[PDB]
Amino acid sequence: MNIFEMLRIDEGLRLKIYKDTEGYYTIGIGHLLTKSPSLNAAKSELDKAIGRNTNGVITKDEAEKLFNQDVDAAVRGILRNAKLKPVYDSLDAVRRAAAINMVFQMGETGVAGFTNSLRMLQQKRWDEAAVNLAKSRWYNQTPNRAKRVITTFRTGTWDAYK
Ligand SMILES: [Ar]
Ligand SMILES: [Ar]
Ligand SMILES: [Ar]
Ligand SMILES: [Cl-]
Ligand SMILES: [Cl-]
């Protein structure tokens, strides 16, 4: 298992514009297109993203390409964030994939706000971090996914995904 297969499991794959768990227009493997309620706006950002008139539908390859760019951007965002980088650098490989997943889902900014959990992670206090991480809107809104990521930080193994 790896970051890609993990996020492919948490996100699914949809080839037509859809709304995500928050009601926002998305496509592919969790590629958010826009926070705007306008379908046209969403279709416009899609065409710009792909480089053609897609009419709201893309192929599997195009979806995978967007996903690769998104995973890459997520990692780079972590490495550029002064609050996240040190945490991430202290982690083992499995736990780093858990940190990437969160950032992918909620943004760098979002993640940078779990101050207390970040410090527990940095300190390798797994169980405590896990309890703190669950005290969040993130966990109350998407609890099955949050539990998989949390267990991943807790144990350092992929069992939640097997
Ligand atoms: Ar992190
Ligand atoms: Ar994180
Ligand atoms: Ar975190
Ligand atoms: Cl893009
Ligand atoms: Cl969920």
UniProtKB/Swiss-Prot annotation:
**Sorted UniProt keywords:** Antimicrobial, Bacteriolytic enzyme, Cytolysis, Glycosidase, Host cell lysis by virus, Host cytoplasm, Hydrolase, Viral release from host cell
**Free-text function comment from the UniProt entry:** Endolysin with lysozyme activity that degrades host peptidoglycans and participates with the holin and spanin proteins in the sequential events which lead to the programmed host cell lysis releasing the mature viral particles. Once the holin has permeabilized the host cell membrane, the endolysin can reach the periplasm and break down the peptidoglycan layer.
Induced by what? Expressed late in the viral replication.
Q: Where in the cell is it found?
A: Host cytoplasm
Q: Please report the organism this UniProt entry assigns to the protein.
A: Enterobacteria phage T4
Q: What is this protein called?
A: Endolysin
Q: How does activity depend on pH?
A: Optimum pH is 7.3.
- Quick check: keyword Cell division in the entry? no
Q: Which reaction does it catalyse?
A: Hydrolysis of (1->4)-beta-linkages between N-acetylmuramic acid and N-acetyl-D-glucosamine residues in a peptidoglycan and between N-acetyl-D-glucosamine residues in chitodextrins
Residues that, per the record, bind substrate: 32, 104, 117, 132
One biological process term from GO is: viral release from host cell by cytolysis
Q: What is its EC number?
A: 3.2.1.17
- Effect ascribed to mutating residue 30 to F: Almost complete loss of enzymatic activity. The enzyme is destabilized by 1.5 kcal/mol
Query: So what does mutating residue 117 to I actually do?
Result: 500-fold decrease in enzymatic activity
The root-end lineage is: Viruses, Duplodnaviria, Heunggongvirae, Uroviricota, Caudoviricetes
The family classification in the record reads: Belongs to the glycosyl hydrolase 24 family.
